[PDB]
C-alpha cells in the first residue's frame, strides 16, 4: 500500500493541471495515465486538428494571395504534413511530462481502477490517498447504424490524412469536431457533405453567426444539410449509400460517399473505473455527478473535465482541475466562470455568454448590436472580410450578456468578451475601451457602438 496526499487519474488537460497545481500547493501527488500523457486534446484532439487546420488555411489562402501578386503552384505532401502533426504532438506531450516531473509529481503508467472510496488498483498493486481526482476524459460516441470500421471513421482516424484522402466524405454532426474536420478534408481535396440533426449547425451557439459560418463553408463547396439525420448505410460497389431522413423522421433520401466521419458527440470514460466499488454517483449519460467544488458524492473524491460534465472543452477541464486541486489542498475554491467555445474553421466561430434566446428566457430585456467584417479595414488588409460580431445585452441595465463572433481570429477575440462578462462590463464599457486601429478586435467595439445606434463605420 503506497500512499499519497492525492492521486490523479488521467493526464489530459484536466488531470495534469490538477496534478501540477496540487504539487505547487505542497501535496505529494501520483498521476496515473493509461495511454499517452497529455490526453485527447494534445494527442488526438485540439492539437493535431489545429495543426491540420493551419496547414489547410495556409494552402487555401494562396488562392487569395494570387490576387496580390503571389504566384505559386502549391503541392501538399500529406505524409510530410502528418509527420509535422506528429512532431507538434510529441513536443507538447513530452512537455507535459517534463512539467509533471519538474513539479515533483510521480507518474505511473497503467489503467487505474478504484477498489474503494480512497483506494485505487493499478497493474495489480494498490495505491491510497486522502484525495482522489478523476480526470478520465471521454471518447468518440458511437452512432446507431454506423459502427466504427474501415469505412466509418471517428475523429482519431480522420486525423491521419496521410493514409489516403477519400474522394467523397460524409460528415455526421454539425458541432466543432465535424465542422473542423469537414473543412480540413475539403481543403485537402475531398468532396464533403455534412449533416446536422438540428435546424442549424452549432445548435448550442448563436444561430445568426453560426448560419454565417455555414454559408461560408457552403461557398467552399461543402454541402451542409441541416434538420437532417443519418439513419444507416449500405456498402455497395460504387461506395457507401447513406440513408438520410428529416430530423423528425419521414421520407428517406440517399447520398453516396467513400468514407463516413461520425462526430455526434463524446462518451465519458467512466465504465470499468471502479466507481461502483467506491460509491461515486454517475448520471444516466455516464457523467460523474459533481458540485461547484468539483466534489463527487464521495467526500475527498473529485471529478473534472469531460468525465464530469459538458461542455466537453479543454480550457474548462483545465480550470476544473485547478479548482479540484485547490480544494484537495484545503482551499475553498469553486467553479463559476463564463466558458467560451471556439470552432477553428475559417472563418472561425466563437461564443461566450447568453444567446438571444437564453437571455430572454433569463428574463432580460434583450437588445443586440451587430457589426459586419465588410466594414473592417483590417479584414480588407488581410485579403478580404467575411464575418460579423454580435453583442447581446440588457437594454435597461446596459449589461453585456453574450458575445458571438464569426471571422478570422474569432477564437482570440472571444477572450476579451469573456473578461468583459467576468468584470461585469456594460455595452458602454466595451464601446469606450480604445481598441487598436486597424485590428479585427475593433469589431467588438463597433458592435457595442451599434448596440447604441452610433457605430461609425456602418450606417445605423
Amino acid at each position: 500500500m503506497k500512499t499519497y496526499d492525492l492521486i490523479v487519474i488521467g493526464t489530459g488537460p484536466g488531470g495534469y493541471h490538477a496534478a501540477i497545481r496540487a504539487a505547487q500547493l505542497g501535496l505529494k501527488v501520483l498521476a496515473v495515465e493509461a495511454g499517452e500523457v497529455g490526453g485527447v486534446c494534445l494527442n488526438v484532439g485540439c492539437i493535431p486538428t489545429k495543426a491540420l487546420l493551419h496547414a489547410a488555411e495556409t494552402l487555401h489562402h494562396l488562392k487569395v494571395a494570387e490576387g496580390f501578386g503571389l504566384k505559386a503552384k502549391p503541392e501538399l505532401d500529406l505524409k510530410k504534413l502528418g509527420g509535422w502533426r506528429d512532431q507538434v504532438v510529441k513536443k507538447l506531450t513530452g512537455g507535459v511530462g517534463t512539467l509533471l516531473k519538474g513539479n515533483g509529481v510521480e507518474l505511473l503508467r497503467g489503467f487505474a481502477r478504484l477498489v474503494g472510496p480512497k483506494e485505487v488498483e493499478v497493474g495489480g498493486e494498490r495505491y491510497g490517498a486522502k484525495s482522489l481526482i478523476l480526470a478520465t476524459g471521454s471518447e468518440p460516441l458511437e452512432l446507431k447504424g454506423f459502427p466504427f470500421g474501415e469505412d466509418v471513421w471517428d475523429s482519431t482516424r480522420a486525423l491521419k490524412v496521410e493514409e489516403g484522402l477519400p474522394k467523397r466524405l460524409l460528415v455526421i454532426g454539425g458541432g466543432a469536431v465535424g465542422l473542423e474536420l469537414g473543412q480540413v478534408y475539403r481543403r485537402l481535396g475531398a468532396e464533403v457533405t455534412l449533416i446536422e440533426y438540428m435546424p442549424e449547425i452549432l445548435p448550442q451557439g448563436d444561430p445568426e453567426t453560426a448560419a454565417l459560418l455555414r454559408r461560408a463553408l457552403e461557398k467552399e463547396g461543402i454541402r451542409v444539410r441541416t434538420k437532417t439525420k443519418a439513419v444507416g448505410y449500405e456498402k455497395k460497389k460504387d461506395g457507401l449509400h447513406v440513408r438520410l431522413e428529416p430530423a423528425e423522421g419521414g421520407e428517406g433520401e440517399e447520398v453516396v460517399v467513400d468514407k463516413v466521419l461520425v462526430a455526434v458527440g463524446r462518451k465519458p470514460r467512466t465504465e470499468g473505473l471502479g466507481l461502483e466499488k467506491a460509491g461515486v454517483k454517475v448520471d444516466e449519460r455516464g457523467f460523474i455527478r459533481v458540485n461547484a467544488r468539483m466534489e463527487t458524492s464521495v467526500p475527498g473524491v473529485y471529478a473534472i473535465g469531460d468525465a464530469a460534465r459538458p461542455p466537453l472543452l479543454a480550457h474548462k477541464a483545465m480550470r476544473e482541475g485547478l479548482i479540484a486541486a485547490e480544494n484537495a489542498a484545503g482551499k475553498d475554491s469553486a467553479f463559476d466562470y463564463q466558458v467560451p467555445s471556439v470552432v477553428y474553421t475559417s472563418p472561425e466561430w466563437a461564443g461566450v455568454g447568453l444567446t438571444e434566446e437564453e437571455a430572454k428566457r433569463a428574463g432580460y430585456k434583450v437588445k443586440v448590436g451587430k457589426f459586419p467584417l465588410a466594414a473592417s479595414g483590417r479584414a480588407l488588409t488581410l485579403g478580404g472580410a467575411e464575418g460579423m460580431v454580435k453583442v447581446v445585452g440588457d437594454e435597461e441595465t446596459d449589461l453585456l450578456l453574450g458575445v458571438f463572433i464569426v471571422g478570422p481570429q474569432a477564437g482570440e477575440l472571444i477572450a476579451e468578451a469573456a473578461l468583459a462578462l467576468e468584470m461585469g462590463a456594460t455595452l458602454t464599457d466595451l464601446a469606450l475601451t480604445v481598441h487598436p486601429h486597424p485590428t479585427l478586435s475593433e469589431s467588438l467595439m463597433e458592435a457595442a457602438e451599434a448596440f447604441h445606434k452610433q457605430a461609425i463605420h456602418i450606417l445605423n
Partner: protein, 39 residues
Amino acid sequence: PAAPSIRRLARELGVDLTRLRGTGLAGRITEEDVRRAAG
C-alpha cells in the same frame, strides 16, 4: 479605477468620483453609487 461607463455617467450627472467611496466588491464604485451621490 472605475469602468468607462461609470466615469462617463459621473460626468453626465456632475458627480466627482474622487469624493466617493464605492460600495462594490473591493471598494469598487457602482452605477448606483454614482446615482446615489447625484441627488
